[PDB]
Design a protein around this nucleic acid. Structure first.
Ligand SMILES: [Mg+2]
Lengths: 98, 1340, 543, 44
RNA sequence: UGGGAGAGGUA
């Protein structure tokens, strides 16, 4: 729900227009522009920047119950960053193995 | 604030009041090596521990022994910088007093026979420098701490290795500190096994039979007994009621007259409560229940005398009948369930084929040493000396503590070897683990891993050398002479010195120090490498040890590790993490008391952290009151959850304790992704120090701690007033209260100027303090290589725009303006040492002279008459540095040739020239020439000039020392003269040097005057013999390698400007490579006119998720806005009061900031000096995880009269037009990494070739060719370029005839191909034929 | 090229044809490998032939049983111990007789394990008879010696020598063989001569394969020595390190940067690095043009770096393609040939389009430059491996020379449209007037405007018919219509162009026009993408 | 070991084989030379 | 000059 509300408020925020009426169009925001172009990144990366970080997993495979609620704009606290280091080091270790 | 803190105050945006100062960051290596050196005779540490664990040693008979008395470390011959120049180990000689006591065999105890003691010089252990480094063979090394598994006992289980069954196989293991291992385990058939030293398996009761146990004592130790009683042809069962839990009644358990259980019914918990409240004991039982149970003890008949039924046999109806007619009226029986009491020892006893103790020892012998014929005494000695010997098995502090904690004992000390009770308790705990009571241990828990630091590893290697020497001394004492044999003729100093030099020079952990900047030095000393001798590898390391365990919170950084194949093996130590007495890792914590967060601090290990509940550092406080919210966030038992504000028992000491040093120098760490923060913290250790270091505008406040405690600057030991500031030395006069009356009170801080480092960068110490300035204790006087006024300054902060620019910043690339190259911002110094050795050949010595044949003025225009390049002569590639020529004829002569030499003369005999030339591409001015020679070889004019300059400098230094010493003694004679009498004017109406002939009538103060005159004469005497010793040391030659006359060392100082190709990086993992230097007229300028210095790429923000670079950009824009306002106020020279008002307005801006600076204390000169230091920008301290917010950033931007969105309207400098969108402009702190394109670029046409395969060599240093690997051969096969593949495997490679004809054909214009068979295939044919297998090329 | 030979006193067994399972000696003699190892270790006697019925063939006796049989018979049976006994056993056996007996034995009953063991032995025996080898040849009597420039003796810089490990292993074999000859001449006791025969067997087996038989013989620095089997076999063996992938002359290496001013088939080599690469070619042109008499004069004229040398290098490097390799070369587009253009610097300026094929970003990468020498090799690099030829990926038939992230951002910002931006609702005479309007500044890139578009459709044959009408477009799409070649429809351009859309544009242009319009379309679309992404100013911020 | 016992031989028909030996591979440009060599061996 | 180990780093 948070990712859908974030994608709605980023895709169609440009509404201040003229010459017919107050009209609506796709937004000229640069983060949405470099996401919708297929240039660098995807909707998962935009969700981690603006919406919610999501549910991060333990190295034992099981998903932790409480998720990382803060994004990379409001800034994580200490315990959420220490939880995120699990998946970051796991992905970096997995990449070398493959 | 200090007086060097009031020069420039970094504004701190933090909100947490820090209660604990950041400790000394090099405390682990200093404390461990100080415990290794220093004499601790009770709590034995290091050398005293090794001496008392080896000595004393008797002979094989026992009539001769060496008693250890004491030891003392000698003084080092050379100092630290002298050892680094001369290229020798900085070590102190070890002298030990060892007493020889002879025992008499004629007397029963003939102790008083001969007492002989002396100082046996053995071993030269190296010493640590004051900043944590060793100097081994000239170079500078750092011995990395090791995270190995602690000694003790570790229960574990493979989670379903048997893919057919799926069962869990629990296994024990007893890991000692030194000795053979021991492993108990289960099989799929549920029998207990033993693998001593990871050998073949045995049944686990065979080691119990080796411990002198029968079946009786084994069953009585492990299992508990149920009793069966035979009375009047019925079976009476003794029954305690707590045994029918979870089992099914096989028969009707009844009473005397009461019915409890029925047939086919579970004896439930209500029936258990019924049994224990009626309290019946004797329960009858029919005969079919005995069939299935086993018997505890043996039963021999009193009449016959033979064993009716022995121990651990299957009881049945016929054996029950035999026992009842024999007359053993009490039957003892094991207890066996399927839930809580499993029959494991009984099944293992039925499998076990041994009989008794000697057969058990023979089978243990046949396992350990197979193929040997066993006997009784060898088996007894083997099983004793594997485990129960004080010399071949040892845990002795940490293994015994972990043993008694994992087995729930009480004493944290005891014996250092195993025991019968110890092995029995390990087997009992493993059986309880298999049953279900208890839980197995994890291996990556930091209560099981332990830091084995430098002093501990050096003590172990010293003990290995001591074991070799004590073996040799035992061999000498058991046979040789006893009376006239001094101990220093026996004890050889070779094995101890060889072992300790091998560890300190060529181990896997004593590695070359990466010291290209102070951050890399401090993060190489705070490093915990899990590899090494007795650790993991890169093959035996899966994702269990590499990944982050939740007990690393505070002890080990999760975001500082190499991103290659060492991704979890090389872990960096955190900031606040100390080290326990046993070696474990512990962190500070704020102990709370009834909700009040008390300032007292407890150090908690990794086992004690999992007990309590610990609050997160980001909880708010009511000015030393209680918590604010009711549901505070906390962590407990390794997981994070929520708790009430009264249940919490501990709080984190600071928000910086989770990270390392290099990961806490990054601003806005919480907004970055963890991968990019990892790469940024790894690249900050490779920043080359530039020409003029400049502070970061957006820092953390950790930079001051790193710059002080890195051991690279010159902090003031005692505060005072500086008396003489030079570019080479600082002379400071101490304050009066911090001065003892013994010394003069003048400190001379010499500064090392342009000393080569390990990574070929420069080390110079520019002073920052001015002449006549009061500095206190602990202020940075001389900025190091990359420091600015005591703050760490690894790079330069320049104006950065975030926009795509015409393709020149495509994928991470960086476009740099011409201002960065014109102002010489990123141009560093690369001092490179070239060395020319002069050998001693078999035809004559190699002379260094300017009489070089077959060379001209174009190469000898820079050499002098001695054959050595002038200091300051800019040389290029190919120019001769040191003129050296080897003789090709002969030099030695006979007296026949002596008389004929007087007749005729000499010859040339100097044909072969091997002069030292500059390698190609290297340039730069010579800055130092150091000519070491050997004692015996006569020097030359250049060598005498070097010794003359060194003698004059040393004479001036010691004359300054003599001057301050006579000044101190004159102050002392003035003090005792005023203490004796009242004499003020007559002392200074006469010159200060003529203060000795003054006197009065003879008294006790006259006697003090004469002995002070005697001290005056001996000060001059020790001065002149120190002068003689310094003169003798610089006159004599160094003892060089055998066959080496003299060694010349030339230092070239290249200056490396940036160019297209040079790597650059920020702090947030946004590395790049300079693709173009774009002119200042083409760079985009804003409305004011200032051109952008670096145009970045904005597409690295979403795909990498590093928002810290954009926040640092905005905060740097605000910082330089305030700095330009102060610079405009200083350029217009408005008012000191207006400057003070604006500076206080900019400092008192945050919402709830920690620091508070008031300028009412500040005078006029301090405010003017602060504005002068803030005219280049106002520095900002943004702490990790508690830094500045967007509200404070926008408030700072609205103060500095800037656009609050952070983006300005950049005009295109190339075409004049305006960009259609606002572009983010702001100052980013850019580094310059050590990957230079001058060192990366390489090419080869045709050079040297290998000798075995005759294909070209590999490497830029030896002019190598690029490898055309297996992947590229497949790519050419995929293309179908068969001709390109043939000419890249034959004529550009190992085929001499084909490549020579190819070279001649390319020179002669005709590009034709003359192929042939390569020579690696012929190497392959000859190697298979040398294996003995006929392989031939069958023609047609 | 010349080998020697060591004349071994006792003939020892080859460790390959004894320990590499299946053992081939246990599979030929039909004896267990443990019993054969007991015979070779001189622990137990074996009997070769016996006339009595008590002792048969291959009955492994102990020492006590042999001492019983020696005083019992002593004349009829002959039992030897060691590798010479196995040599005599392989000599006395008969290959065709055992093959015929096992062929009869296979026919009565067929248990699974017995039939598999019998057919393994029959295949082994039939391999010996059809190859013509003899079973006595597995026992090494004469050991050959590698040539002394293939086991070389290389020095160090301080006078001390650093030999190969093969010289150490050959010294061990020669010393123990000479000691065995001395012990056989000195009439040594049986225990001493048996231990020496066992030592020679251990030394020969260590030289053939160190880590195979037992404990590996370590050298002086506590590391196991490299034998012949360790020279050939492994990751650092002769095959995978020198035979498949060799080191290669005329080769360079440097960091790579971005050159967006290039074409699709060009790369920027530095001046000094290409002078070092093309040095014998410069020698040939110097001696051809008469500016150097001899090869030494030409060598020194290149080494002095004269202006005539730079002009000759500019003439030589013209139209002479070099291969840009980057490791790891996963797929076949990791090697491409480019016509080099000499630049001043130290970094190889690639084209931005080929860095999707190379999987290379400019964060410190490094690429190898190999130079084809012969005319056939230059024609492979010009017809097969030129960077304008391999546009489509060989994995799936889609173009890999594709705009990536910066051209894509620029083209998306071009062909997107706002609602009332600047100068909406005009009528234009065409694409040139639309470009004139934008660069004059009277209309933005996002004005919804009516332009006249003259698109060329394709006929049944190769002719091009045209149509001309008014289309409701933007100004950015009417700027790209100057770039899009003749042959494509307007529905190619008339949407917002993401990365998939530009991939479909290049695929459609390929399948319609060929290769040369596709190459010039990729270069022109990259130029306009870079230019309008620069004119955009698409910045990231915290708002 | 298997090749030495069975007495095998190599006919030199693989791309990896002609990389090791040092000839033109039968893949692309070398295919014409290899089929010419094959028909020369067949017709003689 | 060439060879072999050990440590670190870059893609
Ligand atoms: Mg890269």
């Amino acid at each position: 729900r948070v990712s859908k509300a974030m994608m709605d408020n980023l895709q169609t925020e440009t509404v201040i227009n003229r010459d017919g009426q107050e009209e609506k169009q796709v937004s000229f925001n640069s983060i949405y522009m470099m996401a919708d172009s297929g240039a660098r990144g995807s909707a998962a990366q935009i969700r981690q920047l603006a919406g919610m970080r999501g549910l991060m997993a333990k190295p034992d495979g099981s998903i932790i119950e409480t998720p990382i609620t803060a994004n990379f704009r409001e800034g994580l606290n200490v315990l959420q960053y220490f939880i995120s280091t699990h998946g970051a080091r796991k992905g970096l270790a997995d990449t070398a193995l493959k | 604030y200090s007086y060097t803190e009031k020069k420039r105050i970094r504004k701190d945006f933090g909100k947490r009041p820090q209660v604990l100062d950041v400790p000394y960051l090099l405390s682990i290596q200093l404390d461990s090596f100080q415990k290794f050196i220093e004499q601790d005779p009770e709590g034995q540490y290091g050398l005293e521990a090794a001496f008392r664990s080896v000595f004393p040693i008797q002979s094989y008979s026992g009539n001769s022994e060496l008693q250890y008395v004491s030891y003392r470390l000698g003084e080092p011959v050379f100092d630290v910088q002298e050892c680094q120049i001369r290229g020798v180990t900085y070590s102190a000689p070890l002298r030990v007093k060892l007493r020889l006591v002879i025992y008499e065999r004629e007397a029963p105890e003939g102790t008083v026979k001969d007492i002989k003691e002396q100082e046996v010089y053995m071993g030269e252990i190296p010493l640590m420098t004051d900043n944590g480094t060793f100097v081994i063979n000239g170079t500078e090394r750092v011995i990395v701490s090791q995270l190995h598994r602690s000694p003790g006992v570790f229960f574990d289980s493979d989670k379903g290795k048997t893919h057919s069954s799926g069962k869990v196989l629990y296994n024990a293991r007893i890991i000692p500190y030194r000795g053979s291992w021991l492993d108990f385990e289960f099989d799929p058939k549920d029998n207990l096994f033993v693998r001593i030293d990871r050998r073949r398996k045995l049944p686990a009761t065979i080691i119990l039979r080796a411990l002198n146990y029968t079946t009786e004592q084994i069953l009585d130790l492990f299992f508990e007994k149920v009793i069966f009683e035979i009375r009047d042809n019925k079976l009476q069962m003794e029954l305690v009621p707590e045994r029918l839990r979870g089992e099914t009644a096989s028969f009707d358990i009844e009473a005397n007259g009461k019915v409890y259980v029925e047939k086919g019914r579970r004896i439930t918990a209500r029936h258990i409560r019924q049994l224990e409240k009626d309290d019946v004991k004797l329960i009858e039982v029919p005969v079919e229940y005995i069939a299935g149970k086993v018997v505890a003890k043996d039963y021999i008949d009193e009449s016959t005398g033979e064993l009716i039924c022995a121990a651990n046999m299957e009881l049945s109806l016929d054996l029950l009948a035999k026992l009842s007619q024999s007359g053993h009226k009490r039957i003892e029986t094991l207890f066996t369930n399927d839930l809580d009491h499993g029959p494991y020892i009984s099944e293992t006893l039925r499998v076990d084929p041994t009989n008794d103790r000697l057969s058990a020892l023979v089978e243990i012998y046949r396992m350990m040493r197979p193929g040997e014929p066993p006997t009784r005494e060898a088996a007894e000695s083997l099983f004793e000396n594997l485990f129960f010997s004080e010399d071949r098995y040892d845990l002795s502090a940490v293994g015994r503590m972990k043993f008694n904690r994992s087995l729930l004992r009480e004493e944290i000390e005891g014996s250092g070897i195993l025991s019968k009770d110890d092995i029995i308790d390990v087997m009992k705990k493993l059986i309880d683990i298999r049953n279900g009571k208890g839980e197995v241990d994890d291996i990556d828990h930091l209560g099981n891993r332990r830091i084995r630091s430098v002093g501990e590893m050096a003590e172990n290697q010293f003990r290995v050398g001591l074991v070799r020497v004590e073996r040799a001394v035992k061999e000498r004492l058991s046979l040789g002479d006893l009376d006239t044999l001094m101990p220093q003729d026996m004890i050889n100093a070779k094995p101890i010195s060889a072992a300790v030099k091998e560890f300190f020079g060529s181990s896997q952990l004593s590695q070359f120090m990466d010291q290209n900047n102070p951050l890399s030095e401090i993060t190489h000393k705070r490093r915990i490498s899990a590899l090494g001798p007795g650790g993991l590898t890169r093959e035996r390391a899966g994702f269990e040890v590499r990944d982050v365990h939740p007990t690393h919170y505070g002890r080990v950084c999760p975001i500082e590790t190499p991103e290659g194949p060492n991704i979890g093996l090389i872990n960096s130590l955190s900031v606040y993490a100390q080290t326990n007495e046993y070696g474990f890792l512990e962190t500070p914590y704020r102990k709370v008391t009834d909700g009040v967060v008390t300032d007292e601090i407890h150090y908690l290990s990794a086992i004690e952290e999992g007990n309590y509940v610990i609050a997160q550092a980001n909880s708010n406080l009511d000015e030393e009151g209680h918590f604010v919210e009711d549901l505070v966030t906390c962590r407990s038992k390794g997981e994070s959850s929520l708790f009430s504000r009264d249940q919490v028992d501990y709080m984190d000491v600071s928000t910086q304790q989770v990270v390392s040093v290099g990961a806490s120098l990054i601003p806005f760490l919480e907004h970055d992704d963890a991968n990019r923060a990892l790469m940024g913290a790894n690249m900050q250790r490779q920043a080359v120090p530039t020409l003029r270091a400049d502070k970061p505008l957006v820092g953390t406040g950790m930079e001051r701690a790193v710059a002080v405690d890195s051991g690279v600057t010159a902090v003031a030991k005692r505060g005072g007033v500086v008396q003489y500031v030079d570019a080479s030395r600082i002379v400071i006069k101490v304050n009066e209260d911090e001065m003892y009356p013994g010394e003069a009170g003048i400190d001379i801080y010499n500064l090392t100027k342009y000393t080569r480092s390990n990574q070929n960068t420069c080390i110079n110490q520019m002073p920052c303090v001015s002449l006549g300035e009061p500095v206190e204790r602990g202020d940075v006087l001389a900025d190091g290589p990359s420091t600015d006024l005591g703050e760490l300054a690894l790079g330069q902060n320049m104006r950065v725009a975030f926009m795509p620019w015409n393709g020149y910043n495509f994928e991470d690339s960086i476009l740099v303006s011409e201002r960065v190259v014109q102002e010489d911002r990123f141009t560093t110094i690369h001092i490179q040492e070239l060395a020319c050795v002069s050998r001693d050949t078999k035809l004559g010595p190699e002379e260094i002279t300017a009489d070089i044949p077959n060379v001209g003025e174009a190469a000898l225009s820079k050499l002098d008459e001695s054959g050595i390049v002038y200091i300051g002569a800019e040389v290029t590639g190919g120019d001769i540095l040191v003129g050296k020529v080897t003789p090709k004829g002969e030099t030695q002569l006979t007296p026949e040739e002596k008389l004929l030499r007087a007749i005729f003369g000499e010859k040339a005999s100097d044909v072969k020239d091997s002069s030292l030339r500059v390698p190609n591409g290297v340039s730069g001015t010579v800055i130092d020439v150091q000519v070491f020679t050997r004692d015996g070889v006569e020097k030359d004019k250049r060598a005498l000039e070097i010794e003359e300059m060194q003698l004059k400098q040393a004479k001036k230094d010691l004359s300054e020392e003599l001057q301050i010493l006579e000044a101190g003694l004159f102050s002392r004679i003035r003090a005792v003269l005023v203490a004796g009498g009242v004499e003020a004017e007559k002392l200074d109406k006469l010159p200060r040097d003529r203060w000795l002939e003054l006197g009065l009538t003879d008294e006790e103060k006259q006697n003090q005057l004469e002995q002070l005159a005697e001290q005056y004469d001996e000060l001059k005497h020790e001065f002149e013999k120190k002068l003689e010793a310094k003169r003798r040391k610089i006159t004599q030659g160094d003892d060089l390698a055998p066959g080496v006359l003299k060694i010349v060392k030339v230092y070239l100082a290249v200056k490396r400007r940036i160019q297209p190709g040079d790597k650059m990086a920020g702090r947030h993992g946004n590395k790049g490579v300079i693709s173009k230097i774009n002119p200042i007229e083409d760079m985009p300028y804003d409305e004011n006119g200032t051109p952008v210095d670096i145009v970045l790429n904005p597409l690295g923000v979403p795909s990498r998720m590093n928002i810290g670079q954009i926040l640092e950009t905005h905060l740097g824009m605000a910082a330089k806005g305030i700095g330009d306002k102060i610079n405009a106020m200083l350029k217009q020279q408005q008012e000191v009061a207006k400057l003070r008002e604006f500076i206080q307005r900019a400092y008192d801006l945050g919402a709830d900031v920690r620091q508070k600076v008031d300028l009412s204390t500040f005078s006029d000169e301090e405010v003017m000096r602060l504005a002068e230091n803030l005219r280049k920008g106002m520095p900002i301290a943004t702490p990790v995880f508690d830094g500045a917010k967007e509200a404070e950033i926008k408030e700072l931007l609205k103060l500095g009269d800037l656009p609050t969105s952070g983006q300005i309207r950049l005009y295109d400098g190339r075409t004049g037009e305006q960009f259609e969108r606002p572009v983010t402009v702001g100052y980013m702190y850019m580094l310059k990494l050590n990957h230079l394109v001058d060192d990366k670029m390489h090419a080869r046409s045709t050079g040297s070739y290998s000798l075995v395969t005759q294909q070209p060599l590999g490497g830029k240093a030896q002019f190598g060719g690029q490898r055309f690997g297996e992947m590229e051969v497949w790519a050419l096969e995929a293309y179908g370029a068969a001709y390109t593949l043939q000419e890249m495997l034959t004529v550009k490679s190992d085929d001499v005839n084909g490549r020579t004809k190819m070279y001649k054909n390319i020179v002669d214009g005709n590009h034709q191909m003359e192929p042939g068979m390569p020579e690696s295939f012929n190497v392959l044919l000859k190697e298979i034929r040398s294996l003995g297998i006929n392989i031939e090329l069958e023609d047609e | 090229e010349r080998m020697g030979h060591i004349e071994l006193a006792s003939p020892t067994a080859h460790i390959w044809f004894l320990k590499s399972l299946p053992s081939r000696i246990g599979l030929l003699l039909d004896m267990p490998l443990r019993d054969i190892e007991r015979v070779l270790y001189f622990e137990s006697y074996v009997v070769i032939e016996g006339g009595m019925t008590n002792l048969e063939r291959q009955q492994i006796l102990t020492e006590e049983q042999y001492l019983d049989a020696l005083e019992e018979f002593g004349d009829e049976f002959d039992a030897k111990m060691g590798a010479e006994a196995i040599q005599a056993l392989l000599k006395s056996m008969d290959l065709e007789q055992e093959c015929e007996q096992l062929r009869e034995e296979l026919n009565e009953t067929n248990s699974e394990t017995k039939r598999k063991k019998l057919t393994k032995r029959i295949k082994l025996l039939e391999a010996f008879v059809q190859s013509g080898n003899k079973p006595e040849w597995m026992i090494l009597t004469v050991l050959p010696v590698l040539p002394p420039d293939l086991r070389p003796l290389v020095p160090l810089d301080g006078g001390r020598f650093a030999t190969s490990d093969l010289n150490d292993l050959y010294r061990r074999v020669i010393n123990r063989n000479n000691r065995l000859k001395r012990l056989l001449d000195l009439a040594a006791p049986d225990i001493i001569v048996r231990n020496e025969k066992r030592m020679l067997q251990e030394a020969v087996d260590a030289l053939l394969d160190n880590g195979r038989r037992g404990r590996a013989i370590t050298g002086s620095n506590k590391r196991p020595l490299k034998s012949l089997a360790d020279m050939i076999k492994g990751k650092q063996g002769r095959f995978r390190q020198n035979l498949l992938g060799k080191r290669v002359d005329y080769s360079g290496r440097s960091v790579i940067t971005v050159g967006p001013y290039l074409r699709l088939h060009q790369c920027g080599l530095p001046k000094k690095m290409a002078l070092e690469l093309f040095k014998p070619f410069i020698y040939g042109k110097l001696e051809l043009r008469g500016l150097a008499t001899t090869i030494k004069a030409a060598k020194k004229m290149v080494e002095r770096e004269e202006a005539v040398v730079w002009d000759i290098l500019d003439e030589v490097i013209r139209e002479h393609p070099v291969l840009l390799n980057r490791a790891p070369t996963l797929h076949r587009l990791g090697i491409q040939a480019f016509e080099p253009v000499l630049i001043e610097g130290k970094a190889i300026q690639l084209h931005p389009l080929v860095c999707a094929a190379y999987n290379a970003d400019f964060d410190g990468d490094q690429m190898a430059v190999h130079v084809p020498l012969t005319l056939e090799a230059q024609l492979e690099a010009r017809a097969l491996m030129m960077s304008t030829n391999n546009i489509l990926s060989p994995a799936n038939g889609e173009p890999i020379i594709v705009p990536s992230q910066d051209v894509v951002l620029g083209l998306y910002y071009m062909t997107r449209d706002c609602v009332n931006a600047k100068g909406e609702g005009m009528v234009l005479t065409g694409p040139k007037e639309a470009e004139r309007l934008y660069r004059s500044g009277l209309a933005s890139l996002h004005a919804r405007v009516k332009v006249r578009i003259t698109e060329y459709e394709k006929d049944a044959n190769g002719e091009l018919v045209a149509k001309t009408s008014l289309k409701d477009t933007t100004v950015g799409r009417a700027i790209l219509w100057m770039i899009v070649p003749k042959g494509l429809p307007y529905s190619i351009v008339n949407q917002a162009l993401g990365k998939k859309a530009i991939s479909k544009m290049l695929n459609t242009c390929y399948r319609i026009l060929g290769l040369k319009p596709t190459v010039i379309f990729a270069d022109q679309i990259m130029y306009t993408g870079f230019a309008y992404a620069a004119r955009s100013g698409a910045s990231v911020g915290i708002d | 070991t298997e090749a030495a016992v069975a007495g095998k031989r190599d006919e030199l028909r693989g791309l990896k084989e002609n990389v090791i030996v040092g000839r033109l591979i039968p893949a692309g440009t070398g295919y014409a030379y290899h089929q010419d060599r094959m028909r020369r061996r067949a017709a003689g």
